[model samples]
Target chain A: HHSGLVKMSHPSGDVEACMVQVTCGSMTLNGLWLDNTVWCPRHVMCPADQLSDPNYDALLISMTNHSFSVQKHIANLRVVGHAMQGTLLKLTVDVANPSTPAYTFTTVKPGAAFSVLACYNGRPTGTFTVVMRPNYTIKGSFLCGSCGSVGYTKEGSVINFCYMHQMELANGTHTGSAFDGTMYGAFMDKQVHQVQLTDKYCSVNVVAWLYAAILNGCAWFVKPNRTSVVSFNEWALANQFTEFVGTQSVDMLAVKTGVAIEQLLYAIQQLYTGFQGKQILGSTMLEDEFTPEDVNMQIMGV
Target chain B: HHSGLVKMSHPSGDVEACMVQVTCGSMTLNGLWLDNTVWCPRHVMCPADQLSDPNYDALLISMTNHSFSVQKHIANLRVVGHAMQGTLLKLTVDVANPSTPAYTFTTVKPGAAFSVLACYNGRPTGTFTVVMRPNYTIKGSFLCGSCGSVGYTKEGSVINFCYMHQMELANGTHTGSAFDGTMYGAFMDKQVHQVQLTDKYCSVNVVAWLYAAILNGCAWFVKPNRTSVVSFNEWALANQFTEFVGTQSVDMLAVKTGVAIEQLLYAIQQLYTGFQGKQILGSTMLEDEFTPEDVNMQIMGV
Candidate 1:
């Protein structure tokens, strides 16, 4: 049943004991997470790339059964979903270990503001908004970051690493962008649907990102502490928050599920009403546009 | 925290025992479920409704915390999700009980064909498609019914009850329509994203339909068996099936969460490519359309 190429991750070039690996096949742990491509994990202390050589060809990744199934070259990557979520990288060989699957090691600097396209995939080349970063502590935590990036670099403000969910993950901690499995919320179909972020379903938040990034789009999900028996309207109303909250738990994902995005969004549009849910969506954000100088039909038809 | 009205269903009009109540507030048991309007449960009998009078007002209920929250009048009802899923109803009072929260009795007849609007809410009045009923047993389950209705009807075929999930819910079974917790699949953003449709997260599927119905639109959800650590692309791909399968196990919904529908659909479009995806969506089905021009521009602009 499993027929695909394997793009695995591992401990940096020199580490011997604590290798950066993953536990897959529902049993034996053989693969590693698709982590930083070059800089390496905190456990490692080395630069795998030459200052002169370019960072590996960075691409947004889609983790399926734990390995890379599809990818978005940095340019085509649209990665969009709940803003503060995890983002893995797929860098070039030189930027990585030739023998081991490697990537450009990157991290988010502080106070770096980024933006994602709003909802409404109907229009091409839409506007952008800053995804709130997480503040896991304060009472009025405005979900801190803007789905920002670490190792983020832009080409004429139009292109950059789509890696997302930069931290601002702690309380009293001012961060630029961050995602700790605790997804504050997301923008879809030109609307915003937020949730109660908790440690329990945080990872589900992380994977929600992958769904967005791979297609340079977006997706939805439910929180753990909620009921699955809710009606579509109940589900949306329950999920769609009037505000945002933050958390500090970046862990694993558990809910490998979702319904039709349009279904949920439409429910939202019906419920929220007005300009309440009008944002440039990731799908729409990544979109470009058309038409004009054509003929108007009202008069002709009339 | 849980503030709302309780539209409960008892065992029936007279089933002293096996009372059809619910268990809420995190524990204990008291309330019953919202069952058929007035048909009364098999546990009891007689006629809850007067053939001469009316059933209940019959509103499409939205279950939150296992009870009704937001709802749609039958005329404005638009329950849409994986075709072969559960579609609950909230019928009339005279059709029900004056003392209890009763509703009209309703059920799906058979051999029915229905249609929903095409994608692109950009328009007000769109086209339609007969949602494919599920064939859990066959390889080409065509998704079974077209988000059809059980207690279905129409005001000149323009309005009626919007309960969904018409089976063909079994193997070699030519069911008119059915919905096991296993959601064969769903349509969103004018595209199909089917899953393995297992029993694990079948309830989640049921709830997905409630989402569509409540707002007379649609929503999404993930299955239980898959990993939570996948990328959005992986989640969508893994969840989106190229085909359909059926089963008989309608029970509950577990994933009270979701992402943006536009986000997920965009990913599908990028990957599936072309007219591959492009179907009438529940939201759009529930949607109405617009516009016309007054002037011819080409020469005027020049």
Candidate 2:
């Protein structure tokens, strides 16, 4: 139920207030009991060593139904089947103003960068790349950070905290990883399969080999020997650049060799008798050691 | 700016032609070269995988742009956006008519169940869901007989041989994990954070804790007993679950029992009184020792 753990932006004096921006989703809260009660909001100043001190503070926090609200709240937003349009939202909060009154406390810092988190549906999609300007005006953005963004220290398995989203309320049915970044993209235990492809998928390899030829055009045929057709053929065959070939992305070619479009085109034409895609699914003849290596043939089979 | 990936699909008997849907923001069609190949018309039989393997069939795929029109020439339709909303996409293909040529082919099996790959916006801001059903009857639905779903063996890194949505297209990145139901979500690599309240972000925990309790009722402190009280007090002393003595969200009774409420208007009756929250935070008074082997601390402090 995530009880007694929801609020935001403490008085600026509290150093811990800086961390408020990171926590998303839902938490618990209790406003019915006294201040000394256990699990109460009095925990803000408590130190880490206190957990190890049994003689430390021990109080029970209890709340009344009058102090509760059953309204469903979520920490995520959904965006599917919506028109490709631009939308903007603004959130404002008045904290304990230290400058406005005599009992003032904290002030917003300048260099403080505000980060936004979002999920496609309910998963850690990625963090938006926030581009902050000189006036603290952020214009650029990227995806929300994933589950691994939540930091977690290495401990056996006490109770790790996690941030999760769902279409329906979480009735404690689903389990998620504790916010330990170390285990962030790690999958829970299960048996999964790996696929295999033949024929067309096999052509992917042919394309890869053909891709080698596409790349070799520059080194063997293109400018190396523009007038030597026989040498170009021999060089292409030597480098395995010519013959039947297949290729996918244009960048794959550009990324490998600094050669631009025209050079790549000439190489393609020289390598392929016709169109670059002529031998797409077909194979090219290759020269190989045709003799069998087995000694049985020498004995009688040959 | 996710440059969507080249997608592949197979349709049941090409009843002349059919239309397919584009779930992501958009798609583009390119022949082996980056030239303007085809702008998929609405309700067109997807051009078969001719470039790679003619034996392989084709399924109409919706895209943002491709110059060619499949509808007017061959029996293929390439619709965009919502044109693929229904199963009965209209295209002309010969049926079992005796007088006409029946260009029928069995529907090829589909891929795996869909899992989230990326989010739309940054993070902590949106929620949406997408489901793509095959364009055939349930009888030809692609599902694994063993795993009881559309199971795909991960080939290399890419999970299913399908479209990479807006996010992945932006980066040309793909992910494939052994099908483990436990893996609810994933994100690209990034720095990590923990869930426990730390000195740096303690206030965030306090706010979340408070909000959680205000909604779910303080079930943690319903029971009453010396041991329970001590446990509660110790928890408050060690963690940032509640406010300190002079802090807010704490009443005298709550300081003793460990519960903050909206009703009990009690003042700080006694500073170090029987329910001293100061003692709880600064030092512990519970029967159990904070550390494991500190049982002898009472008399063995010497």
Candidate 3:
């Protein structure tokens, strides 16, 4: 069990907007439910009649309470799932306040009951709970901006974001980076896993590496030889030029990326998460270290 | 033309890392060229060999200098483009010092040239540039915490982001919100057009009506009687839920959203911009005014 001060505040400083800040005793969770923060449009600037609609009020109540509930209980989130496909993660989140009402959200798609058992960072951990959605997107999703098109899953205690099209192994670990595979004519081969999840489901390293690569580019992947690093950089520059032309249209890009529609949606969800939680998660030194030039070399290299 | 006290400082405050802040005279920009901020990784964690490589150091220098140049000369960025497929944006930015040098980044895809002329809000404007990119993901692009998928374009002296795959008129205005379309068996009919850019391609609105919408979702687009408003809200809820599922996968979602792979990549670039330059762009109240639930409704409606 985890115990600490649970505080949820809206950046706008709305007093009644479900801003939960309280300390509570440890508690156990039989299930897990999570949704990103919500902002009520009616609360911002609605006209007379629209504001009077009970639906508007209902929307506000739902948003505030949901925000409070998720922030009040969940912490140290870790998710893992297939890179491009959707994954249903089972979770068991703890609540500090018994007074907190039971909460849940609905997905447009019919969700099912599925569980994943696996190891991560070398520990045999698993997930158990009900009602959660982990989807992927091809291009990406943006609540306010570009959150990558990575999918997300949370099992027991494992929480991670992944790509819908990553490679996988039934019971083996998928470990590597986004640059593991080379870019072929229109697309890269399946042998190149861009992300890794849990062994029970998939590996979680490929995407981890992708994330790392995006921020640091090939800086981390640079070879020891000065020639090797420059060679990679040159390749990256040329590849970017070629790829930009190869995938000019969205449909063409989709075919080249080899992502499914549902996976694309899930990717959008992941992007939404990234966009919404950017402040908490966006600050990485990787971007600081890697420049466009650096990324060109790293992305193009072997 | 733009002039102001430009000061660039690293969030981490690393002295060697390039952060540009300067004062300049107002000038007009005929085109636009922009890349998100760059971060140096060595400052974070890396091996001695990778850090010591001469190529790595050279890459770092190029990045620092580039970052310094972009930050020193450009301020107040905006973009706009078609939805779905990627669109190469034309850009022409001024240099504080002619000796600042000419620079361009590489992409994995081969970009194309396209031009758009129109009016935003109610003023005539246009965009022209070359060898740039306009990609999209599902939802949109975001920086740290702020999601702004609006495509970006530059005009006489303007720049703003816009929606891709939106309905169009040869010489007509594309008027609507982010939720004017319907999801079919797989894709949604093009209709929603929420963002507005300047004729010269500058200035972005987080919702001149959002403050109004928070007060009421249908406030801005209200028709005669509560009938129009209610219809919109109902449509919005269902639409959000449906589209959420329809675009669940990357491939399926891409078709549904009609976003191009290049547009998605561009969106990713925007997010990188948001992530790296979040301190400057992350303070908008738009993110606060809209929540996932609110979005569901707003994104769904007629």
Candidate 4:
């Protein structure tokens, strides 16, 4: 385990960087800022405990959308001075204002956990548990920002996490298309197991992100419930994930997932329509910001 | 038709209301402040021509979300002074700036024309034509706002106009459910005739005002085309029409339309799911803005 009070760089100005180490029992979910400039995709977080360090106040921060498709998170953001209390990561913008959480009294609650892959070869059953809580009231849809998705696979034992790459717009505009099926990112191919969560915080077929917009992706559970939606979309947009296709170009997701093109189109239709019992139907995706951009950004429950 | 040289009232204070008269052939769409306070659902517009009136500077204005849900147009608005020169009704809001057109250098191009309803029985074939144009780029939606809706019925002869009553937040929040179907007002029950329009400005199924939210209602044609969408949603939200339902309450729309309860639910599911070719698969509705509100609010082209 590595631990040190590292030097840091930021989009706006330099700030002190505090490093906290995580053992194999816990996984952190922030950027692995190796040399203050290098963006390391592998094992980026250092546990939520480090968030308590006052030195992180102005250190640049970013949540990865996925292992790939990372964004230039140096959006000139700063900690809201003593605001990161008890599981909260509040932010102020050095970028623009008003649109990003930097403007709103925004607080982000990161999701973290560590599970031992069974001594078994791999895809076996295991204990899977991750919870998301917000400091504010969620009044629209669940904004599962870079906080990442968490759910138990079909049997309720194995975990299914479809972290980041999701996006939405409050106006319901076209977002992006990034699924192996649409010849883009491959999200739904595996969620076909119907991974899900049912806390009052979530209710429907959890993360088929397949046909949903960034805003509506974490929304199947809320189906028609409009009040529980959150404002997590602001994070997605501020991160400029508007054109965010999970794996990059059309060649990216398809080759990676091995899913055919036409079948993916059909899958999109079913998902783009509405969320039903998971067996019946699930509605829709990005015509492509681009309805316009990020849901969790706006639809979240506190 | 009444001609005039009358005094006016302005919300930003007394500038001028530019009173003009319509000989009938043309309908001007501003406020018909009979004495400033006598709200007349009667004749609100005089003629788009009168929009050329220089006296309209500083005149408080509002477009009726419907013939009923009129807001206090005195949102401290004024003509950009010289901004209302062409086919546009440029406005500077007198109310809280930004959110409303009062903030954006917005130009509303009013829809008008005198369609003589047979001058005989009442309902018959007529010269139905209404065109909407936006001077700026319409990147996200149509923004019907008070601009109103116009279209030829099934036969393309008789006009079926369903105007106003739309609202949306860029965040897709629960706006409000006011349709008579779910015991609200009766917007869809009639549009069942599939009342629609199709200029490049508007395509697909136009103006069903049914299962769709304020943002998606005008989105049938652009099902997958994301670029044509506009920012008209600003108008709806700025107008504070988020909770806007056509009539008042449970006794409002349902009592007026007399459609059965169960059927409305079914209609909503079908519509809420997706926009098919006007038949087999036209999807969805609102749980309310209260998946959300407004289109022509955000789904326009002009």
Q: Write the per-residue lDDT of candidate 1 for residues A1-302, one digit (tens) a residue.
A: 11000111111111111122221122111111233232111101112232123122221122232321212111111212211123222222112222332223233321122222211111111112222223221111112111221222232212233223222222222122122222223311111222324311121222223322222223332212232223433443454332211122111111122333333334333423422333322221111110000000100110
lDDT of 4 by residue, B1-302 (tens): 00000011001101012111111134322221212221111222333444334233233243322212222331323222212222223232223332111111111221111111100011111111122211111111112121211111111222222121122223221011111112012212111122222112111112213323222323233232122112322322342222122323322223333432233333433444553435321223222211111212112210
- As for TM-score, the candidate ahead, 1 or 2, is 1
**Residue-level lDDT tens digits of model 4 in A62-181:** 332221222232132332221222222222222333211111111122121111111011111111112221111111121212121111111122123112212222322111111111
Residue B68's lDDT in candidate 4? 25
Off by over 4 Å in 4: A1-87, A90-302, B1-44, B47-87, B90-145, B148-302
TM-score of candidate 2 on Cα atoms, chains taken together = 0.16
DockQ of 1: 0.01
Predictions' DockQ, in order: 0.01, 0.01, 0.01, 0.01
Q: After superposition, how far is residue A262 of candidate 4 from its true place, in Å?
A: 42
Q: What proportion of the real contacts between chains A and B does each prediction keep? A: 0.00, 0.00, 0.00, 0.00
Listed for every candidate in order, the interface RMSD values in angstroms are 27.2, 29.1, 26.1, 31.3
How much does candidate 1 score in TM-score? 0.18
Reference-based lDDT, each prediction: 0.21, 0.22, 0.22, 0.21
DockQ of 3: 0.01
Per-residue lDDT of A26 in model 2: 35
Least accurate 10 contiguous residues by lDDT in model 3 chain A: A1-10
